[PDB]
């Protein structure tokens, strides 16, 4: 359900115009309609973020609990610091070689294609291919795992009833499939170790403590819940950019090392996910707004990445920024536990795609905005090289 200043598709695929206007007029504001106070500014989405205990991430236990997502500390703390090992900067970089290996394989898939869409080619697979890996997906089980992964976040045939009924049937007849599948495998792996991500989740111990079958299953469910979706929208939301503003596309491809500031721009400028949810535990006065407990605050980080108080040349993309203190992977104790990851298959993915030369925007394309207004990224867009 998206905010009434976002009103044609237009809007919705570059809000932040609006989001700029809705920030200098009210950095706060109480939406009657959406019944959930906003949050535009920097200084005030960081707090939110870092006051857990005003501003809380659990959720009303008839929704799914995603795992360490929608808890809050001790709770929160124990579980993250159990799968914390395994989502590090070190931790991940052996894996390079194979993201390599698979967006080359992604990319060869379609050379004698003269466009292709990079979501559905290249965009959209890679995270699913990678995160079975890292999980431990059995490569000839990937097929069905791919398949209700994508199911797991598909759109509709049109905004009705009558398709979001169905979608929400697909959408959940995935998270059934994978909570099979995980389950099956988790089992498997708990009475027989493999060199994979869930093996190392079920033998993680801190004082004492283990994750529990539960956890890790509706951890591995997360991670796809949280991982696919937003790579697949970096990847994408950054050839996005890369084809609207050739001059950051082709500066980039001949500074190469210019990627990992290509990957936190795009983040800043096109934010796979501009809005973070919480609910007030406390009442608290934010500036001049009185938020009470039980309250859904909604802090958008599309807003705060172009504060001005923050952030030079807002809204300029620049890969030499000094510093890129976005707020796309969050801020605090929930900040993203993939961020290394999303950063490395995000920067993998972009230096292959220049690699392969020069690349445009594909005429007269619809551009079909994701349905969630707090999701930022297409559905498709089709691009080719020269
Ligand atoms: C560009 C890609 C991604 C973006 C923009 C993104 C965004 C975010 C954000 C904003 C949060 C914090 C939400 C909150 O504070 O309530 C978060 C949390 C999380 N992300 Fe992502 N994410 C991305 C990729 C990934 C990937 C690839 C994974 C794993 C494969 C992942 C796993 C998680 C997990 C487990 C959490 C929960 C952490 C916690 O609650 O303590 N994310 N992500």
Redesign the pocket.
């Known amino acids: 359900i998206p905010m009434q200043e976002i009103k044609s598709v237009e809007q919705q695929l570059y809000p932040f115009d609006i989001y700029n206007s809705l920030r200098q007029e009210a950095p706060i504001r109480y939406d009657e309609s959406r019944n959930c106070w906003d949050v535009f500014d920097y200084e005030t989405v960081k707090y939110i ?1 870092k006051n857990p205990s005003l501003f809380s ?1 659990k959720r009303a236990m008839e929704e799914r609990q995603e ?3 929608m ?1 809050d500390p001790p709770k ?1 703390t124990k579980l ?1 610091n159990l ?1 914390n090992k395994a ?1 590090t900067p070190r931790a991940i970089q052996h894996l390079e070689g194979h993201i390599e290996e698979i967006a080359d394989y992604l990319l060869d898939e379609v050379s004698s294609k003269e466009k292709f869409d990079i979501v559905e080619d290249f965009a959209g697979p890679l ?1 699913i291919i990678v ?1 079975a890996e ?1 999980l431990g997906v059995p490569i000839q089980d990937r097929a069905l795992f791919k398949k209700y992964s994508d199911d797991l976040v598909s759109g509709a045939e049109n905004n009705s009833d009558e398709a979001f009924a169905k979608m929400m049937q697909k959408r959940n007849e995935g998270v059934i499939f994978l909570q099979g599948y995980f389950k099956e495998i988790i089992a498997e792996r708990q009475q027989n170790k493999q060199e994979d991500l869930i093996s190392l989740l079920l033998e993680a111990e801190i004082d004492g403590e283990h994750l529990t079958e539960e956890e890790v299953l509706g ?1 591995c469910i ?2 796809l819940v ?3 979706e ?2 697949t ?2 990847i994408t939301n950054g050839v996005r950019y890369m084809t609207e503003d050739v001059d950051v596309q082709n500066e980039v491809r001949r500074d190469i090392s210019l990627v990992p500031n290509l990957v936190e721009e795009t ?1 800043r400028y096109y ?3 501009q809005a ?3 609910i007030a535990a406390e009442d608290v006065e934010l500036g001049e707004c009185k938020i009470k407990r039980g309250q859904q605050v909604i802090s958008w ?1 599309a807003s705060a990445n172009r504060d001005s108080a923050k952030f030079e040349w807002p809204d300029t993309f620049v890969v030499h920024r000094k510093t890129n203190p976005h ?4 801020f ?8 290394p ?2 950063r490395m ?2 920067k993998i993915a972009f230096t292959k795609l220049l690699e392969k030369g020069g690349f445009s925007k594909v005429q007269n394309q619809s551009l079909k905005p994701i349905d969630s207004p707090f999701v930022f990224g297409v559905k498709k867009y089709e691009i080719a090289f020269n």
């Open positions: 973020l991430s795992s360490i997502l808890m929160h993250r799968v989502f995270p995160i890292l951890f997360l991670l949280a991982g696919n937003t790579t929208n970096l983040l934010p796979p996910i973070i949810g919480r980080a707020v796309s992977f969050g605090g104790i929930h900040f993203c536990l993939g961020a990851l999303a298959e995000g």
